[PDB]
Design a protein around this ligand. Structure first.
Ligand code: 8PE
Ligand code: HEM
Ligand code: HEM
Ligand code: SMA
Ligand SMILES: OC[C@H]1O[C@@](CO)(O[C@H]2O[C@H](CO)[C@@H](O)[C@H](O)[C@H]2O)[C@@H](O)[C@@H]1O
Ligand code: FES
Lengths: 127, 107, 199, 123, 74, 330, 50
């Protein structure tokens, strides 16, 4: 079975970088399809962040293109999310998801990570 | 960027009946529209894809249909419990965009 | 292979033609033809059997001539080239119920009833299997068995799911000689007729 | 070329049609079957291939019913991988028609085809 | 005149062996009837059936009725 | 031979031709008998060291005849055009697709089309008519090789000190088995004519359906099991043909100083191990590809080859030494 | 029809000529007989049915 396990610090200080990781099991990241990152704002609204194809190509939402950097590690079969210079605007629950692709039906995010609530705060937390 | 408008914007309904949500894109998306279900606990599952295709595990009571710019997500009944927020997204062109959402509650 | 997949083993009945010195029981063959005509013929062809072969086996020359004439066959076109029909003759082969495979399947929910001219030799079990199949339909399938819509349960058929439903029921035929037409009697008689058709 | 009416084919049902002397398999795959088809790790396949690279519409599996080992016709809804089973030397194919076990070296071949309304033209 | 095979089958379902076999099938049937009432039965992939029990019963009946049936027929 | 008329023409032989059923049952049951007797002929040779010098040529010509006979029987079976005929034709011709680079072209050439069709059956019948004549010519070559050295005997020693003319003695001794053979063949032909065959061959060939009950002709089963034992296409085909060609290594792997098994305890034992292993291979072939038959077939396959390549040379060497130290002393 | 191609006419011309005639096709799913336009594999049709 396919599983997406998310991890990473769910609390970042403004101007810093948000680093999230998605560990995939039961399916190789290089085999095919697209590996995405999406966010759910407090007002309960979703926004597609971007992805990294099975070949290693990127596709970022122009609304964040200049800030994000979605990379991957073939050996560990996991992809990452990096959002530079965060603001309280970036506060949301981030999710990683696999997007299938068929020539007739198009794209569809079938497998979703459990989600990670990230809070852009000045508060201190024991690392 | 294409923008979808869901309606009714989060409206409650009774368990002993059906409900029909809808999405309207600012452009022609050509049936490339999917529906998602975000449960209260936070878990989000895929419900419908390509306007009417049902995903694995979703009950046959979930319909979903449309074309051009107007689409819908018809349910047969809320029993036992389908209380959660439903989001729609197009994938005709990048970047992909989601709808406002429609939180379904009980009367 | 599971029991269901293989199909229940057909038991050994005491056919009177079993054994090196035994001929077929021709009264049984005759009765079996009647069962074929009145029941099986609606869905099953007997293409490899010529009318004339029944003569001196199960019917008289006159009887077969009369049976053959009840059917129509394509004759040679008339002097103007127009198509014409003619009554059947001894040289003709017993006609099937369908004009083609498409029609056959359309009349049986997609399934094709096989020709029965060689069925006894074309199935493991021979007469025993044919007989057990015809008399082996339970009123209901065993618990936990999901029968595909349009199918019928029969343990003797590999997989248990067969497109043919039970067709033999007590007294559905009136035997010319007075023999009680029970389900097992008809199954025994028609199987014997089919064994003769094959051999 | 050969045409088939897809509208006449119910959900979990297999259809076999002749094309150039060979049988062509057509299955209307269910949602559960579609997920099963795209949720297998390539490491478990001797002939690694995604389900998307084999079908245009996830709902319609169209392939040549010719076992790649020695040419027999695999039996539908059989085998240990929820797909097809070749009775000749025991090759098992999954719900995407990929080879999973047995002597066959490759997945069932996908023939060229195109959709047109409620029907598909193979050729 | 009722069906000769039906009569013979009914007779042998009543012997000691016949009754033990019907009992074993009936026990399996009840167990299956209960499993079906349970929530999420359609999603199990390991659903039990009573073909094996039914086969044991039928095989026994066939072993007894097969050598006797034709003496009752014409 | 036309693909649309083939099956029916055999039925025409069974039904309309006077004594046609006798001709057909004799030909079909005769083929099975041909193989049973051939297996016994080959086994006798194996047991009595008939393959040993000066009869290596005789043995080799015999192997060629074995191959031609199997090929002939295959071609004939295809002519019935029943379900087993179509699928046997498909699988066997496909054996050549394993040849690297040109395999698929060879198969298309043999078929004369996209698949086993009219061109195929018509050429198979033409070839089925031809090969028996090639076999007859090879039999003449076999007899010529036998004639220059004469037959061996059960003692494995020279027969030059006491010979008796073929005429009368062996002419009449051969008659005894000729009648026994005919008696047994007649029992099958008239009383149980389809026992050695497959019911599926009474079903016309269908290019779209391979029956789940498909099984090769009984005499091909051991070789079929050997092929099935290898979980690789190419190696399976290679190993199966090697099972026949390995017969050619016997004059070289038999290291014994005496001809035949009559006076050899260990060799006699292992010969029977080989015989029953062959029967087992045949039984495995008649079974489905399931546990524990797969492993059994693989072990029996190893044993089949081990006999020629390991058991015979090792045992024959041990026995040479045993014969030496069991009498000589110092 | 195919034999005329590259001899006296082009593939296109022969295809158009073949399609002017009707030939028996496989019966429909109901078993009812049906016709179809000729193709390159068909043989030039005669003026009489018998
Ligand atoms: C590529 C193909 C490879 C070759 C395949 C091999 C074919 C399998 C064998 C075919 C069956 C024939 C059985 C083997 C024939 C026996 C050979 C032989 O020559 O045996 C001689 C032997 C005793 O003879 P002696 O000369 O040694 O006696 C000494 C007297 N002072 O005689 C004896 O000890 C008695 C013979 C006992 C018969 C054994 C029969 C078992 C056969 C099973 C067949 C059943 C199949 C369903
Ligand atoms: C007593 C008269 C009949 C006899 C002797 C008979 C016999 C048979 C036999 C032996 C088979 C082959 C099963 C196998 O493949 O092993 C069969 C199949 C079939 N029969 Fe009959 N049959 C009779 C009447 C009918 C009737 C009246 C119909 C149509 C209403 C019918 C429809 C079929 C069908 C559809 C099949 C295909 C089953 C399958 O492959 O799943 N039969 N029949
Ligand atoms: C159409 C098939 C064949 C025919 C007609 C044939 C005929 C003969 C005849 C008449 C003999 C002498 C009598 C006897 O020992 O039985 C002989 C001897 C022999 N044959 Fe064959 N044979 C055939 C196939 C084979 C095969 C397939 C092999 C081996 C693979 C073979 C190996 C031998 C050997 C080695 C002998 C010598 C036996 C001895 O004297 O020790 N033959 N054959
Ligand atoms: C134009 C002439 C040609 C191409 C001649 C070709 C001859 C080839 C070989 O003869 C020398 C070949 C027959 C011989 O291989 C050594 C046999 C042992 C092959 C045995 C054989 O049989 C099968 C069979 O019979 C079947 O029946 C329905 C089905 C089969 O699979 C399902 C097989 C099969 O899988 C094998 C290996
Ligand atoms: O297609 C036949 C149709 O009949 C039903 C009616 O309930 O099946 C019942 O009758 C059959 C006739 O013998 C039995 O074989 C079957 O087991 C029994 O349930 C339908 O279920 C079936 O589709
Ligand atoms: S032909 Fe399918 S496994 Fe050999």
């Amino acid at each position: 079975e396919v599983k997406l396990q998310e991890s990473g610090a769910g609390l970042v200080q403004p101007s810093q970088s948000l680093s999230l990781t998605c560990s995939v099991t039961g399916y190789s990241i290089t085999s095919g399809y697209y590996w995405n990152w999406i966010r759910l704002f407090p007002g309960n609204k979703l926004e597609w962040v971007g992805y990294i194809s099975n070949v290693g190509d990127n596709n970022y939402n122009p609304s964040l293109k200049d800030r994000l950097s979605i990379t991957r590690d073939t050996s560990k079969n996991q992809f990452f999310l990096k959002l530079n210079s965060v603001t309280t605007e970036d506060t949301a629950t981030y999710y990683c998801a696999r997007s299938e692709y068929y020539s007739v039906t198009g794209y569809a995010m079938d497998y979703w990570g459990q989600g990670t609530t990230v809070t852009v705060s000045s508060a201190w937390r024991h690392p | 960027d294409i923008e979808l408008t869901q309606t009714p914007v989060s409206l409650a309904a009774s368990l002993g009946d059906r409900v029909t949500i809808s999405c309207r894109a600012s452009q022609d998306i050509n049936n490339f529209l999917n529906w998602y279900q975000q449960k209260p606990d936070g878990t989000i599952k895929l419900l419908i894809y390509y306007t009417s295709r049902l995903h694995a595990g979703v009950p046959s009571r979930f319909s979903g249909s449309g074309s051009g710019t107007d689409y819908s997500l018809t349910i047969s009944n809320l029993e036992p419990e389908d209380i959660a927020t439903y989001f729609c997204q197009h994938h005709i062109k990048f970047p992909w965009t989601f709808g406002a959402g429609t939180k379904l509650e009980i009367k | 292979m599971t029991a269901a997949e293989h199909g229940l083993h057909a038991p050994a009945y005491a056919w009177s033609h079993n054994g090196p010195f035994e001929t077929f029981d021709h009264a049984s063959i005759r009765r079996g033809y009647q069962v074929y005509r009145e029941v099986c013929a609606a869905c099953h062809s007997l293409d490899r059997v010529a009318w004339r072969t029944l003569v001196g086996v199960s019917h008289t020359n006159e009887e077969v001539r009369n049976m053959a004439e009840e059917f129509e066959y394509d004759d040679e076109p008339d002097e103007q080239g127009n198509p014409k029909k003619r009554p059947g003759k001894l040289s003709d082969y017993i006609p099937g119920p369908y004009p083609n495979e498409q029609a056959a399947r359309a009349a049986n929910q997609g399934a094709l009833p096989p020709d029965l001219s060689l069925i006894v030799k074309a199935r493991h079990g021979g007469c025993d299997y044919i007989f057990s199949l015809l008399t082996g339909y339970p009123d209901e399938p065993p618990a936990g068995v999901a029968l595909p819509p349009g199918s019928n349960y029969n343990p003797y058929f590999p997989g248990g799911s067969i497109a043919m439903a039970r067709v033999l029921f007590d007294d559905m035929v009136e035997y010319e000689d007075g023999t009680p037409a029970t389900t097992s009697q008809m199954a025994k008689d028609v199987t014997t007729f089919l064994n003769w058709c094959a051999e | 070329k050969v045409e088939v009416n897809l509208a006449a084919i119910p959900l979990g049902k297999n259809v076999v049609v002749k094309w150039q002397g060979k049988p062509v398999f057509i299955r209307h795959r269910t949602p559960h079957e579609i997920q099963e088809a795209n949720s297998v790790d390539m490491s478990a396949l001797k002939d690694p291939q995604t389900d998307a690279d084999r079908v245009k519409d996830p709902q319609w599996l169209i392939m040549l019913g010719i076992c790649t080992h020695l040419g027999c016709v695999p039996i539908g809804e059989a085998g240990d991988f929820g797909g097809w089973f070749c009775p000749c030397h025991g090759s098992h194919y999954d719900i995407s028609g990929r080879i999973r076990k047995g002597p066959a070296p490759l997945n069932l071949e996908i023939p060229a085809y195109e959709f047109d309304g409620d029907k598909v033209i193979v050729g | 005149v009722t069906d000769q095979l039906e009569d013979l089958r009914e007779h042998f379902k009543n012997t000691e062996e016949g009754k033990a076999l019907v009992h074993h099938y009936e026990e399996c049937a009840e167990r299956v009837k209960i499993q079906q009432q349970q929530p999420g039965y359609a999603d199990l992939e390991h659903k039990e059936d009573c073909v094996e029990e039914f086969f044991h019963l039928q095989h026994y009946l066939d072993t007894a009725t097969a050598p006797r049936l034709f003496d009752k027929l014409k | 031979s036309n693909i649309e008329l083939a099956f029916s023409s055999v039925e025409h032989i069974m039904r309309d031709v006077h004594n046609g059923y006798i001709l057909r049952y004799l030909h079909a049951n005769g083929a099975s008998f041909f193989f049973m007797v051939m297996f016994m002929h080959m086994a006798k040779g194996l047991y009595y060291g008939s393959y040993r010098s000066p009869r290596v040529t005789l043995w080799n010509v015999g192997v060629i005849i074995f191959i031609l006979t199997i090929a002939t029987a295959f071609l004939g079976y295809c002519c019935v055009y029943g379900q087993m005929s179509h699928w046997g034709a498909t699988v066997i011709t496909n054996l050549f697709s394993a040849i690297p680079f040109v395999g698929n072209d060879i198969v298309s050439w043999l078929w004369g089309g996209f698949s086993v069709s009219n061109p195929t059956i018509q050429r198979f019948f033409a070839l089925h008519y031809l090969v028996p004549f090639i076999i007859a010519a090879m039999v003449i070559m076999h007899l010529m090789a036998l004639h220059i050295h004469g037959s061996s005997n059960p003692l494995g020693i020279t027969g030059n000190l006491d010979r008796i003319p073929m005429h009368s003695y062996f002419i009449f001794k051969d008659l005894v088995t000729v009648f026994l053979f005919m008696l047994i063949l007649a029992l099958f032909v008239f009383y149980s004519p389809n026992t050695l065959g497959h019911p599926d061959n009474y079903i016309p060939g269908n290019p779209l359906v391979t029956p789940a009950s498909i099984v090769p002709e009984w005499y091909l089963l051991p070789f079929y099991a050997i092929l099935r034992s290898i979980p690789d296409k190419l190696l399976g085909v290679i190993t199966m043909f090697a099972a026949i060609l390995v017969l050619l290594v016997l004059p070289f792997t038999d290291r014994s100083v005496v001809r035949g098994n009559t006076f050899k305890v260990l060799s006699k034992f292992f010969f029977f191990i080989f015989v029953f292993n062959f029967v087992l291979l045949g039984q495995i072939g008649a079974c489905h590809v399931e546990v524990p038959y797969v492993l059994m077939g693989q072990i029996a396959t190893f044993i089949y080859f081990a006999y020629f390549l390991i058991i015979v040379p090792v045992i024959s060497t041990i026995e040479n030494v045993l014969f030496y130290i069991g009498r000589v002393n110092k």
